[PDB]
Point group: D2
Chain length 93, copies 4
C-alpha cells in the first residue's frame, strides 16, 4: 500500500509544472465541482473498474490528486505537515 | 502515512454517518481557507510558528475532509487509487 | 435585470425548500465549471455559438445559484447589498 | 433598486485590477468557503445591520460581489449573457 509521500512524488514525476501553479488550483476546484455532482447523485460505495467514472470514489480521488499536486507545487511535505500539527495538537492538551 | 490507515485513524474520532452534509460543508470551508493561503503566498514547508494558515496546513485540512468524506461515502481511497492506475494503463498500454 | 426581480423570477420555476442541499451542490458544480472556463481562457463576451462553456455562461450559472440559495435561505440580495454599503460607510465616513 | 449592470460597474470603479485576474478567482473561492460555513451554522433569514457579519445573506452577497468582479475582469456583460441564454432557451423549445 502506497505511502502519501510516494503518491506525491509519483505525481511529481509525470505532472509537475511549477511555472503553472494556478493550473493546479483551477483543477482542484474543477474536481471539487465534479465531487459535488457525484455526491448530489448519490454515487457512493466502492466502485469496480467499470463503475469508476463519475463515482464519489473517483471524484474524491481526483481531489486528492490535486491536493498532492498542489503540495508539490507549493513545496509542501504532507507527512511533515502532519507531524507539526501533532506537536500543536499535543500542547492543546 | 498510508491512505487506508489515515482514513481509518480519522474514522476513530470523527465519524457521524447521520451528518454527511457536515463533511461536505467542511471540505468547502477548507478549500476556501486553502484559496486564501495560496493568494497570500504562504507557500513552502512552515516551521511550527508558521504552520497556522500556511498553504501546508490548509492542504492537510482539505486532505482530512477528503478522507472523512471517503469514510462517509463507503470509499476506500487506496483501492480507488489502484483502480485509477489500472484504468489509465488499460487506456494507453500497448 | 434587478436583484430582487431576478431572485423572484427564478423562484417562480425553481423553488424546492425541502431540497436546500441541492442548491448548495449545484452552486459548487457551477463554480467548478467556472474554474474550467477561466483555466481554458474562454473570456470575453461570447457570441451565441461561443456561449456554451464560456466564462460568461458559467458566471451566469453561479449567479443563478446565488439567487436560488438566497430564496432558499430567506435572503433578499438587494436589501443585503444596501446594508453592506451602509456598513462600509459607517465604518469609514468622517 | 440597483440594476445588475450598475452593480458590476460600481464595483469596477473601486475594485478593478486587470493584471491580477487570479486574485478575484481566489476571492470567489474564499467567499464560497465562508458561505459554506454560514449555511452549515444555519445563519439564514434577512439580517439587520448588526446581524450581518457571518450571515448567509452577507456570504451570498460576497459571492455575488466576486461574480460581478470576475465579469468585469473577464469582459463579461451579465445582462447580455442572459439575453443570449434566453435565445438558446427559446430554441429548446
Ligand atoms: Mg474528476
Ligand atoms: Mg483550515
Ligand atoms: Mg454551467
Ligand atoms: Mg465573506
Amino acid at each position: 500500500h502506497m505511502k502519501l509521500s510516494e503518491l506525491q512524488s509519483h505525481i511529481k514525476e509525470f505532472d509537475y509544472a511549477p511555472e503553472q501553479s494556478e493550473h493546479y488550483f483551477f483543477k482542484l476546484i474543477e474536481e471539487v465541482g465534479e465531487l459535488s455532482e457525484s455526491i448530489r447523485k448519490g454515487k457512493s460505495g466502492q466502485p469496480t473498474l467499470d463503475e469508476l467514472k463519475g463515482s464519489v470514489a473517483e471524484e474524491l480521488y481526483d481531489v486528492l490528486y490535486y491536493v498532492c499536486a498542489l503540495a508539490n507545487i507549493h513545496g509542501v511535505n504532507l507527512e511533515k505537515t502532519r507531524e507539526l500539527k501533532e506537536v500543536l495538537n499535543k500542547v492543546k492538551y
